[PDB]
Design a protein around this ligand. Structure first.
Ligand SMILES: CC(=O)SCCNC(=O)CCNC(=O)[C@H](O)C(C)(C)COP(=O)(O)OP(=O)(O)OC[C@H]1O[C@@H](n2cnc3c(N)ncnc32)[C@H](O)[C@@H]1OP(=O)(O)O
Ligand SMILES: CC(=O)SCCNC(=O)CCNC(=O)[C@H](O)C(C)(C)COP(=O)(O)OP(=O)(O)OC[C@H]1O[C@@H](n2cnc3c(N)ncnc32)[C@H](O)[C@@H]1OP(=O)(O)O
Ligand SMILES: *[C@@H]1O[C@H](CO)[C@@H](O[C@@H]2O[C@H](CO)[C@@H](O)[C@H](O)[C@H]2NC(C)=O)[C@H](O)[C@H]1NC(C)=O
Ligand SMILES: *[C@@H]1O[C@H](CO)[C@@H](O[C@@H]2O[C@H](CO)[C@@H](O)[C@H](O)[C@H]2NC(C)=O)[C@H](O)[C@H]1NC(C)=O
Ligand SMILES: *[C@@H]1O[C@H](CO)[C@@H](O[C@@H]2O[C@H](CO)[C@@H](O)[C@H](O)[C@H]2NC(C)=O)[C@H](O)[C@H]1NC(C)=O
Ligand SMILES: *[C@@H]1O[C@H](CO)[C@@H](O[C@@H]2O[C@H](CO)[C@@H](O)[C@H](O)[C@H]2NC(C)=O)[C@H](O)[C@H]1NC(C)=O
Ligand SMILES: CC(C)CCC[C@@H](C)[C@H]1CC[C@H]2[C@@H]3CC=C4C[C@@H](O)CC[C@]4(C)[C@H]3CC[C@]12C
Ligand SMILES: CC(C)CCC[C@@H](C)[C@H]1CC[C@H]2[C@@H]3CC=C4C[C@@H](O)CC[C@]4(C)[C@H]3CC[C@]12C
Ligand SMILES: CC(C)CCC[C@@H](C)[C@H]1CC[C@H]2[C@@H]3CC=C4C[C@@H](O)CC[C@]4(C)[C@H]3CC[C@]12C
Ligand SMILES: CC(C)CCC[C@@H](C)[C@H]1CC[C@H]2[C@@H]3CC=C4C[C@@H](O)CC[C@]4(C)[C@H]3CC[C@]12C
Ligand SMILES: CC(=O)N[C@H]1[C@H](Oc2ccc3c(c2)O[C@@H](O)C[C@H]3C)O[C@H](CO)[C@@H](O)[C@@H]1O
Ligand SMILES: CC(=O)N[C@H]1[C@H](Oc2ccc3c(c2)O[C@@H](O)C[C@H]3C)O[C@H](CO)[C@@H](O)[C@@H]1O
Ligand SMILES: *[C@@H]1O[C@H](CO)[C@@H](O)[C@H](O)[C@H]1NC(C)=O
Ligand SMILES: *[C@@H]1O[C@H](CO)[C@@H](O)[C@H](O)[C@H]1NC(C)=O
Ligand SMILES: CCCCCCCCCCCCCC
Ligand SMILES: CCCCCCCCCCCCCC
Ligand SMILES: CCCCCCCCCCCCCC
Ligand SMILES: CCCCCCCCCCCCCC
Ligand SMILES: CCCCCCCCCCCCCC
Ligand SMILES: CCCCCCCCCCCCCC
Ligand SMILES: CCCCCCCCCCCCCC
Ligand SMILES: CCCCCCCCCCCCCC
Ligand SMILES: CCCCCCCCCCCCCC
Ligand SMILES: CCCCCCCCCCCCCC
Ligand SMILES: CCCCCCCCCCCCCC
Ligand SMILES: CCCCCCCCCCCCCC
Ligand SMILES: CCCCCCCCCCCC
Ligand SMILES: CCCCCCCCCCCC
Ligand SMILES: CCCCCCCC
Ligand SMILES: CCCCCCCC
Ligand SMILES: CCCCCCCC
Ligand SMILES: CCCCCCCC
Ligand SMILES: CCCCCCCC
Lengths: 533, 533
């Protein structure tokens, strides 16, 4: 068996004679949430014959159990415990007779749980062993930037692993409302890299002599293709049935990239300047028209998020709704960000399975790729432009590039510390992928500037590493992204599992499927088949 | 509603006082089948109060109705009538008192049916008008053979139209067991064209100076790719779930093509001869080992079909089983071919939805691309090879090519006439796509030779027609096939219909999808993107 993944068996024995017990369950990860009923345990009919009730408790995080007298609505005892996967626990509720009439509840482990993260530890050990063997085996025996392809390839490899299931591990899934996991990293990085490629390609194109009007037509064609491919190809689940307009999801990943690419590229094209040939600020001062408009857009996001009144909803609400925030705003998932989507697009055209629907039991439709959060996608893509400006403005001096990448990583990291208050749920603006919050952008941009700080001198300047095998997917990013959406259910990326409730079998299937997309992109590289939108 | 597509309402009124009626239904298309119970009409409780029972009768073909006294198992009256779609008919069973005690049953049309084939006529008229308008507007204002590309493109367009539904018309679907429809034409034509291309490409390759071992390796690689793509990509329905070995279909279209290509290409390579430069027979005499082996294979097919004993089944059985042949051999669908498929591969690895399951109500699994029909696939491919030999041997003289095509078409047509006895279900070997019978192959080869005879002087010699718009799909056949398999459910090839029981909406959807695939192939042609296995 009755146990599923990340579940343990809990047996409650009620030795009390005149007390009915209701067991409530709360997860320690669920912030300011309500207790949910777990199981009702009746009173013991006779002394020495305890009443037994069974329940399944989630073991992904810590569990908080509250046992309340049903008749008197009074708390009997409170229990905090972290259960283990496929464990068998017994909770005995008996009244101690050592001079008092109090009730003491204790928990016993009938059968020990299993190590849930053992496959992940073994997979990391196996992967590290392969790298060492390959490294030791060989010891005995305008140009395209390789570090940008390597950094894009890393995000593509992480994308396929987590989109295909991630081993069904909670830290390889999206966070419910607040915080960061491994799955919440790749999308901002793709926006960061896309902005860098905007400046790198535009500078070379305009240098050779292409006109701005002809380049404006190329920007609009690429944006149109990205939006159309997302709505028609990527978004729908055609296994359910033929497409109907009433159930078409308008927002999405490629629609966000298409709108973000258009705004940033047009902004860069409109105020484009030639790149001139230590203490200089010429990559920032020369682009002050963009910066002034970017901070005006950022003020609009802050103004609508914290000041726009949402009917039947608090102003500036940043919680998930549902049973969160003590269940006072069940239909307020997203605050003003979700209100704008429901008002402009309607619930039928939004994303129907938000990540908060499991931990906070939200009922309304929220789209993480909403309208309001597109402002912060432009901010993230404009920080990629700054990364591409440092590379080209100071190409001659490697030390100049490294100094600028360190200053931006440190400054953007300091803003995140003040905004998040180094906390998951506290702070002025908590990190939130669903809202695409400001501290989400500054945190992931700080990571992106640090990755370039390490990848650029290792891969591009010194050449100690060629980026293998990451740069092969990085040169066919659209083929890999569109490919794994179309062929998600196909063999050999997916096959029937002997045990659907096993972390080991899910992880092995997802690792093999990810390694096949790296191999597919390697064959395309060897055959010189590259597709660009 | 109650009426579905291709259905009529039948109301039976029973005026008899002491007679219970059971109405049996048999389709005129179903050959030597059993009557099936349609509806039970109770006796009339009182005079002047007839008992009414309603039933839905199929309107695709003519209907045979038999009304039998339930108690005495005796026939009251028999009725033959072709009902119309969405019609409302009343069948009154009353006993005539004009000097006798007989029972007379008459049928009345309460509401007239609709014209089912009106959308097809309108579509044909629209297409003819568009063709005439385009022609008048244009009037006012080794190289590849273009006729082979045009023929392949015609086959591909028909394939895409009929696989997407064909308007849900019965003549755009596969025949149940015996006979021919439009859907049963394209696969033998593809095999024929594949053989012709085999000879053309092999002659061109061997002329330039390539070795036979490299060509053998290329042949093996192409066959392996075709078989693998058929088994892993095209056959499974991944909308149902992840691939499990127990429910994997091994036979299929691309597997048949791969095996046939391997056998025919290896046979041609083994006995390859240079092409030398009216009454000559040098294209047939020079390939006598191939002809001898082909006749040996045909003899093997005939012997296994008409002489191999099947347990619990007659020898030489060619019927569909089920309720066919008076329901005497329900589990004998396919005879020796189905027996060989079930013995060598097992029922779980065959086609679970044979075309005979609807008309003859068969319950066993039969695969149309079985093991025994590969012999006749090879025969069809060798006839295509002979067509290519005629094309290349007498390239200088158009009259010789025309004479040879006419002679081959006439001989194959005479063989088909002798085998089928110009009948659907009679004759020594009736035409059957499921069995891939000899008469099927000879008929389709005669049709292909006639098509080549028409196309070659019009398209290749005189140049009156360029093959538009057929050669655009004809030059990307594998891309079109695999794409329409992969993107069958996607927009704009499919969308939710207002009325799922309408021929007009299904036909419009299928025509639009076919036109879109032709446009995709044209776009690929303009961008010079050609994929060959
Ligand atoms: S799911 C959650 C995550 N979402 C996704 O993964 C969505 C998928 N997105 C993607 O794959 C990408 O972000 C894309 C395809 C939308 C955009 O890729 P981008 O990084 O913008 O660049 P792409 O490879 O498409 O090429 C754009 C331009 O940048 C240039 N470019 C790309 N990489 C580099 C590089 N390292 N150095 C120099 N120029 C480069 C290309 O040459 C091209 O310029 P051109 O058209 O003048 O030749
Ligand atoms: S579903 C029911 C029906 N099933 C199907 O339709 C299955 C799909 N099948 C198909 O699309 C085809 O039959 C295929 C792709 C399997 C085979 O196509 P073929 O007719 O064998 O030819 P294809 O275009 O693949 O090329 C084969 C060779 O013939 C050559 N060729 C093709 N057409 C011509 C022509 N008109 N003139 C000269 N040579 C030609 C090609 O150049 C190639 O030779 P090469 O490798 O030396 O360059
Ligand atoms: C279990 O019983 C306790 C009583 O100790 C409940 O706590 C009270 O909850 C009410 C709201 O229903 C508050 O107004 C009180 O202030 C709470 N008292 C204390 C001491 O915290 C608790 O809510 C009960 N559990 C559930 C799930 O209802
Ligand atoms: C969880 O552990 C309990 C022990 O506390 C198991 O209950 C025992 O089951 C065996 C098998 O029939 C009996 O012989 C014992 O008498 C039971 N003990 C008690 C105290 O009830 C229980 O079966 C375990 N659950 C699972 C799913 O294995
Ligand atoms: C309806 O009744 C007729 C009787 O006239 C049945 O015809 C007979 O069928 C049996 C088989 O059950 C044969 O042995 C007889 O030779 C048939 N007689 C004639 C005159 O044909 C007929 O089968 C009945 N209909 C159904 C569906 O059973
Ligand atoms: C098929 O036609 C019959 C007529 O023969 C329809 O029956 C009539 O229905 C109307 C509507 O209630 C009644 O007023 C008449 O008295 C009925 N006539 C008889 C003879 O019963 C029947 O409704 C039609 N079926 C459909 C599906 O439209
Ligand atoms: C000029 C743009 C692009 C950037 C700055 C946007 C600022 C000025 C906008 C964005 C959202 C706006 C708020 C939205 C809604 C309300 C509630 C209303 O009862 C009073 C005004 C108030 C509080 C607005 C004040 C101005 C505001 C904060
Ligand atoms: C053959 C000679 C030049 C030795 C080559 C050693 C190469 C393969 C090794 C030496 C040090 C390594 C780097 C050390 C640390 C990092 C940072 C990490 O976040 C990504 C990998 C990266 C960037 C490694 C890439 C591979 C690397 C460059
Ligand atoms: C030599 C091959 C390749 C071509 C000719 C094949 C002929 C000779 C084969 C094919 C199938 C064979 C038949 C298959 C099964 C039986 C039933 C058995 O109880 C007697 C022999 C008999 C009737 C065989 C006779 C020979 C046969 C007709
Ligand atoms: C511009 C001058 C040369 C006139 C061109 C006329 C062309 C477009 C016309 C004239 C006769 C036509 C052909 C007449 C009959 C057939 C047989 C049919 O099964 C396929 C089309 C085909 C092969 C036609 C193709 C188009 C055709 C060749
Ligand atoms: C890391 C990441 O890819 N995250 C994005 C993820 O996209 C998916 C979701 C599901 C699936 C995706 C891609 O690919 C298919 O092969 C498999 C299928 C299971 O989930 C939502 C989409 O609504 C985005 O907001 C989010 O940024
Ligand atoms: C004219 C022809 O295409 N006929 C072959 C047809 O293949 C299909 C069948 C169904 C579908 C096919 C292709 O394509 C998808 O887009 C749509 C889906 C509905 O039916 C069986 C397959 O087992 C073959 O025996 C037969 O030769
Ligand atoms: C406990 O619940 C049962 C079920 O209704 C009830 O009969 C019993 O009276 C309850 N006990 C107390 C002490 O309320
Ligand atoms: C007709 O069938 C009904 C239903 O069982 C039965 O009661 C009646 O007796 C039958 N009539 C005759 C004549 O057999
Ligand atoms: C789940 C908690 C998130 C906390 C945010 C992380 C704070 C660190 C800011 C980035 C520091 C610089 C890293 C290179
Ligand atoms: C010298 C080449 C000139 C070509 C002009 C092309 C104009 C592009 C128009 C795009 C407008 C898109 C608006 C959303
Ligand atoms: C020369 C080709 C021009 C193509 C123009 C396509 C128009 C679509 C514009 C999409 C804009 C979306 C971002 C707001
Ligand atoms: C009461 C009506 C509120 C209307 C709010 C309008 C929101 C539109 C701004 C979204 C910006 C997106 C930039 C890409
Ligand atoms: C289930 C199999 C998925 C394969 C997807 C491969 C994507 C690359 C397309 C290449 C097409 C063939 C070109 C030679
Ligand atoms: C190149 C000189 C002659 C070599 C002949 C090789 C013939 C290969 C075709 C037959 C192979 C049969 C495999 C089943
Ligand atoms: C001059 C080039 C010689 C290359 C030889 C390649 C041999 C191919 C062997 C294929 C065998 C397939 C058996 C089914
Ligand atoms: C040089 C590449 C050789 C590839 C060999 C592949 C072997 C598969 C042979 C398939 C034969 C199928 C028809 C029986
Ligand atoms: C009783 C055992 C019967 C065995 C029959 C064997 C059938 C194999 C011949 C199929 C020929 C396929 C040619 C490609
Ligand atoms: C379903 C009816 C079977 C008829 C078979 C075809 C009979 C004519 C044979 C082909 C004659 C030549 C046509 C060009
Ligand atoms: C030099 C020869 C010119 C081509 C001759 C044209 C006539 C052959 C076409 C036959 C068509 C038959 C249709 C029934
Ligand atoms: C439902 C969408 C249909 C797409 C069909 C694609 C067929 C050809 C693939 C081309 C890939 C892009 C190359 C520029
Ligand atoms: C780019 C916008 C495409 C939107 C697709 C709409 C689908 C309509 C289906 C018709 C059924 C009502
Ligand atoms: C069906 C007959 C068509 C003509 C066959 C002979 C062609 C001769 C051309 C000179
Ligand atoms: C025992 C855990 C194995 C997980 C898969 C290893 C890498 C394919
Ligand atoms: C947890 C994923 C680690 C992947 C290591 C390489 C594959 C064995
Ligand atoms: C009334 C019949 C219309 C059928 C579709 C027309 C061609 C798209
Ligand atoms: C019955 C199909 C006819 C197609 C004619 C052209 C499309 C309007
Ligand atoms: C080669 C002929 C095999 C048997 C055909 C005739 C069977 C009645």
């Amino acid at each position: 068996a009755e146990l599923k993944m990340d579940q343990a068996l809990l047996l409650i024995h009620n030795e009390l004679l005149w007390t009915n017990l209701t067991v409530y369950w709360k997860s320690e990860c669920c912030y300011h949430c309500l207790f949910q009923v777990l199981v009702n345990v009746p009173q013991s009919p006779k002394a020495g014959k305890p009443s037994a009730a069974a329940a399944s408790v989630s073991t992904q995080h810590g569990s908080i159990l509250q046992l309340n007298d049903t008749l008197e609505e009074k708390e009997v005892c409170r229990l905090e415990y972290r259960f283990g996967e496929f464990g068998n626990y017994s909770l005995l509720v008996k009244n101690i007779h050592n001079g008092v009439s109090e009730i003491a509840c204790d928990l016993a482990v009938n059968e020990d749980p299993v190590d849930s993260n053992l496959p992940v530890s073994i997979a990391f050990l196996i992967g590290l062993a392969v790298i060492i063997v390959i490294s030791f085996l060989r010891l005995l025996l305008p140009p395209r930037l390789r570090s940008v392809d390597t950094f894009r390839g890393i995000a593509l490899i992480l994308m396929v692993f987590v989109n295909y299931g991630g081993g069904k591990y909670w830290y390889f899934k999206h966070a419910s409302w607040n915080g960061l996991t491994v799955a919440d990293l790749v999308f901002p990085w793709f926006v960061f890299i896309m902005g860098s490629s905007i400046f790198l390609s535009m500078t070379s194109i305009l240098q050779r002599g292409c006109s701005k009007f002809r380049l404006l037509g190329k920007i609009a064609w690429r944006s149109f293709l990205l939006i159309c491919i997302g709505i028609i190809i990527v978004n729908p689940n055609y296994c359910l049935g033929p497409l109907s307009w009433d159930k078409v999801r308008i927002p999405g990943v490629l629609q966000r990239l298409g709108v973000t690419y258009f705004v940033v590229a047009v902004l860069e094209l409109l105020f484009a300047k030639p790149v001139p040939e230590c203490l200089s600020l010429r990559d920032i001062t020369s682009s002050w028209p963009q910066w002034l408009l970017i901070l005006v857009l950022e003020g609009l996001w802050l103004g609508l998020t914290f000041l726009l009144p949402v009917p039947g909803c608090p102003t500036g609400y940043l919680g998930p709704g549902g049973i969160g925030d003590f269940g006072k705003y069940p239909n307020c998932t997203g605050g003003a960000a979700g209100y704008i989507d429901r008002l402009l697009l309607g619930d039928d055209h939004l994303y129907q399975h938000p990540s908060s629907a499991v931990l906070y039991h939200t009922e309304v439709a929220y789209d993480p790729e909403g309208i309001l959060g597109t402002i912060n996608s432009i901010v993230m893509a404009f920080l990629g432009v700054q990364a591409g400006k440092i590379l080209l403005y100071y190409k001659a001096r490697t030390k100049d590039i490294l100094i600028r990448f360190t200053a931006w990583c440190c400054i953007l990291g300091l803003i995140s510390v003040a905004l998040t208050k180094v906390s998951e749920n506290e702070g002025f603006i908590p990190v939130n992928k669903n809202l695409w919050s400001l501290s989400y952008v500054t945190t992931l941009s700080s990571f992106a500037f640090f990755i370039l700080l390490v990848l650029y001198p290792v891969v591009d300047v010194k050449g100690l590493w060629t980026g293998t095998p990451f740069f092969y997917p990085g040169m066919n990013s659209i083929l890999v992204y569109v490919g794994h959406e179309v062929f998600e259910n196909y063999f050999p990326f997916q096959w029937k599992l002997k045990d659907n409730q096993s972390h080991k079998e899910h992880l092995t299937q997802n690792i093999v499927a990810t390694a096949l997309w790296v191999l597919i992109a390697y064959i395309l590289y060897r055959k010189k088949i590259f597709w660009k939108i």
